[PDB]
Amino acid sequence: DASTLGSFTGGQLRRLGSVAGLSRADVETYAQVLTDALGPVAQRPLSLAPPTRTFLSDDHTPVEFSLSFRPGAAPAMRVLVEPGCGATSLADNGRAGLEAVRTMARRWHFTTDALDELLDLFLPPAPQGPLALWCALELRPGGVPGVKVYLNPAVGGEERSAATVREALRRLGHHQAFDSLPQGSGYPFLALDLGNEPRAKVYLRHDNLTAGRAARLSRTDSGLVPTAVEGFFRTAAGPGSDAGGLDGRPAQSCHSFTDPGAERPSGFTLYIPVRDYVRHDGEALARASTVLHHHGMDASVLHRALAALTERRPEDGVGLIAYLALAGQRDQPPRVTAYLSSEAYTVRPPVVELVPR
Ligand SMILES: N[C@@H](Cc1c[nH]c2ccccc12)C(=O)O
Numbered sequence: 001d002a003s004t005l006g007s008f009t010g011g012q013l014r015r016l017g018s019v020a021g022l023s024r025a026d027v028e029t030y031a032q033v034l035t036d037a038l039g040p041v042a043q044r045p046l047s048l049a050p051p052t053r054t055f056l057s058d059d060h061t062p063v064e065f066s067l068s069f070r071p072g073a074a075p076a077m078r079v080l081v082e083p084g085c086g087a088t089s090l091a092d093n094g095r096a097g098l099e100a101v102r103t104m105a106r107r108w109h110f111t112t113d114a115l116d117e118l119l120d121l122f123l124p125p126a127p128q129g130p131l132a133l134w135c136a137l138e139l140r141p142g143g144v145p146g147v148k149v150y151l152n153p154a155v156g157g158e159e160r161s162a163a164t165v166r167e168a169l170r171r172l173g174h175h176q177a178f179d180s181l182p183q184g185s186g187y188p189f190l191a192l193d194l195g196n197e198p199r200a201k202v203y204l205r206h207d208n209l210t211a212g213r214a215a216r217l218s219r220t221d222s223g224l225v226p227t228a229v230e231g232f233f234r235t236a237a238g239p240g241s242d243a244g245g246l247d248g249r250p251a252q253s254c255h256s257f258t259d260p261g262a263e264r265p266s267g268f269t270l271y272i273p274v275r276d277y278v279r280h281d282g283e284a285l286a287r288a289s290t291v292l293h294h295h296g297m298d299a300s301v302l303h304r305a306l307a308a309l310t311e312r313r314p315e316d317g318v319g320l321i322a323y324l325a326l327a328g329q330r331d332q333p334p335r336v337t338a339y340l341s342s343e344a345y346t347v348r349p350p351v352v353e354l355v356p357r
């Protein structure tokens with residue numbers, strides 16, 4: 001009866017899945033997919049120390065959830081997992097991550113050619129942190145997910161990051177796409193969409209980002225306009241804004257290459273780590289709700305999502321809403337995403353009353 005990482009994150013996937021409008025059938029399928037993806041660490045009691053060598057979340061839970069809101073669309077639920085979590089080495093973590101993805105490929109028969117083209121760059125021997133391989137599953141109605149793989153451009157050291165992204169973009173048929181990207185402080189992730197023509201995603205870190213610099217990271221042909229980017233920045237950041245740049249953990253951007261041979265991105269997303277810029281998740285939830293309303297969408301599902309993940313009041317803690325994102329793509333209205341923490345390792349400490357007190 002003791003909670004495990006599997007039983008705990010499975011329960012969250014089920015409760016958030018129902019909040020998101022998924023059928024009992026699809027919820028069952030996806031809970032089994034998450035248990036399988038976690039591998040042996042699914043059986044780990046939550047009373048044991050976490051895998052402190054997983055970076056995926058602040059409390060080292062190897063699962064994070066997200067709800068993506070598009071105007072007129074059903075909310076889309078995603079889960080991010082590190083399948084190699086609990087491996088004794090980063091090299092073995094990557095090998096277990098790749099084994100998990102190949103098992104998903106055998107199940108749903110999506111193409112892995114694009115991934116195979118990149119493996120020598122991203123899974124070398126003696127890899128460097130902070131990750132080897134993450135997988136995100138879009139929990140699509142019908143039980144066949146969309147699959148995304150996240151890899152580490154800094155695997156050979158930060159100095160080799162730019163060259164690794166440039167070579168990855170070349171091998172995926174986007175030529176010198178690298179030179180299209182704005183200036184960044186680093187290259188935390190390269191991600192591939194895997195399905196039935198790969199969508200390549202380059203992530204940039206932006207230290208001390210300002211509203212003005214944020215507005216200049218994207219172009220017309222990427223789906224967001226400058227005033228929408230600045231408005232999102234100021235709503236999401238609250239205090240950290242208009243003070244010389246965001247002063248907590250950094251903003252990140254994503255640049256999507258979808259057209260074959262295209263050297264320019266079709267998509268742009270800005271991520272703000274709202275957890276570093278609020279008193280508590282009540283404040284994060286109010287700022288998220290403002291952003292959703294501003295882009296013509298209902299917020300009540302996001303309110304229900306927090307109650308599904310945890311018993312605690314939003315106002316009694318921070319970090320449940322980890323990031324907010326504004327996501328652009330050519331010929332689409334903006335998309336708003338809330339990244340939602342599992343907090344499997346963030347518990348109410350035991351009640352032992354001091355008397356006298
Ligand atoms: N927790 C890590 C990785 C991560 C998880 N979800 C994210 C969403 C956006 C950017 C990074 C992340 C970080 O803050 O860097």
Ligand SMILES: CC(C)=CCSP(=O)(O)OP(=O)(O)O
Nearest residue numbers: 066068080150189269325327
């Ligand atoms: C950087 C990490 C780990 C997750 C954010 S990637 P994402 O959810 O924004 O990608 P999508 O464009 O929503 O498929």
